[PDB]
């Protein structure tokens, strides 16, 4: 049983209200290399009208960048998609009172997933965050990424992310057994959050 579902990358009020009927959390992307990027003012509006937790999602690297974006948007939740220092992560929680989900890339430095898993756990232990997101990759290495993530998921209630779709999320869940899943383009139709795709995704998460 997955307890947490996040649909990331809402760009409009229409996409937000749709996602809110299904997801435990959503996210709005700023100051990042992303098709879902919106200006800070646009993110500030979605953050104000959201009725579920909405993450300010970004690859911003430095404290002043994050601090400016938190001041301008009023974000309560942030998703740090970068290797900003745990000390800088902690400064944001104390000085702005935000909850943090930290995203980690799944390393592919060994053919044995257990060794990539050991390296990943030592990086994760360096942070004090509400939530751990594991961002899985593509191609043939994806099966390796699931094997790594499955080891991590025994130690932390991780959120599994990366290329999830209605067609493949069932295998990802019973392979990795995460506490949560995160999906973006897998529930888009021509780049718009799509109700029928979301319902197909949720059916798998709730069924088995």
- Within 5-85, residue ranges assigned H as helices are 13-19, 40-49, 63-73
For the bound state, the minimum distance from the C-beta of residue 77 to Na ion, rounded and expressed in Å, comes to 20
Reading the block at residue 152, the tokens are 């991590």
130 lies in the site for Cl ion, by CB under 5 A? yes
Tell me the site size for Na ion, rule CB under 5 A: 2
Q: Which is nearer to Na ion, 28 or 159 (CB)?
A: 28
For the bound state, the minimum distance from the C-beta of residue 89 to Cl ion, rounded and expressed in Å, comes to 8
Give the CA distances from residue 42 to residues 16, 18, 19, 20, in Å, rounded to whole numbers and listed in that order.
Answer: 12, 17, 17, 18
Q: Which is nearer to Cl ion, 115 or 130 (CB)?
A: 130
Contact 158/134 with Cβ under 8 angstroms?
Answer: yes
Segment near Cl ion (CB under 5 A), from 31-39, 73-81, 124-132, 196-204?
124-132
Task: Give me the half-sphere count of Cα atoms (radius 13 Å) on the Cβ side of residue 100.
Answer: 23
Q: Which is nearer to Cl ion, 127 or 175 (CB)?
A: 127
Phi, psi of 63 (to 5 degrees): -55, -45
Residue 103's beta-bridge partner residues? Answer: 133
Which of Na ion, Cl ion, none binds 41 (CB below 5-8 Å, type-dependent)?
Na ion
User: Which residues in 27-46 contact Na ion (CB under 5 A)?
Assistant: 41-42
Which of Na ion, Cl ion, none binds 100 (CB below 5-8 Å, type-dependent)?
Cl ion
Question: Which H or E run contains 135?
Answer: strand 131-135
Segment near Cl ion (CB under 5 A), from 9-17, 71-79, 95-103, 149-157?
95-103
For the bound state, the minimum distance from the C-beta of residue 45 to Na ion, rounded and expressed in Å, comes to 6
99 lies in the site for Cl ion, by CB under 5 A? yes
Which of Na ion, Cl ion, none binds 130 (CB below 5-8 Å, type-dependent)?
Cl ion
Return the CA Rg of the chain.
Answer: 16
Helix (H, G, I), strand (E, B) or coil at 88: helix
C-alpha 108/C-alpha 202 separation (Å) is 30
Tell me the site size for Cl ion, rule CB under 5 A: 4
Residues engaged in binding Na ion (CB under 5 A)? 41-42
Residues engaged in binding Cl ion (CB under 5 A)? 99-100, 129-130
């Amino acid at each position: 049983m997955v307890e947490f579902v996040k649909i990331c990358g809402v760009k409009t009020m229409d996409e937000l209200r749709l996602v809110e009927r299904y997801a435990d959390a959503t996210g709005v992307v700023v100051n990042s290399r992303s098709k879902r990027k919106v200006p800070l003012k646009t993110a500030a509006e979605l953050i104000e009208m959201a009725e579920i937790p909405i993450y300010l999602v970004s690859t911003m690297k430095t404290f002043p960048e994050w601090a400016n974006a938190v001041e301008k948007t009023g974000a309560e939740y942030i998703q740090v998609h970068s290797d900003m220092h745990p000390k800088a992560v902690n400064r944001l929680k104390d000085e702005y009172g935000v909850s943090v989900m930290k995203a980690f890339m799944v390393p592919r430095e060994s053919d044995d997933p257990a060794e990539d898993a050991e390296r990943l756990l030592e990086l994760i232990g360096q942070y004090e965050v509400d939530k751990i997101l594991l961002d899985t990759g593509v191609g043939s290495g994806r099966r390796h990424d699931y094997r790594v993530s499955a080891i991590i998921a025994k130690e932390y209630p991780i959120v599994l992310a990366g290329g999830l779709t209605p067609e493949n999320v069932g295998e990802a869940i019973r392979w990795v057994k995460p506490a949560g899943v995160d999906v973006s383009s897998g529930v888009e139709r021509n780049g718009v959050k799509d109700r029928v795709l979301i319902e197909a995704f949720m059916a798998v998460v709730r069924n088995g």
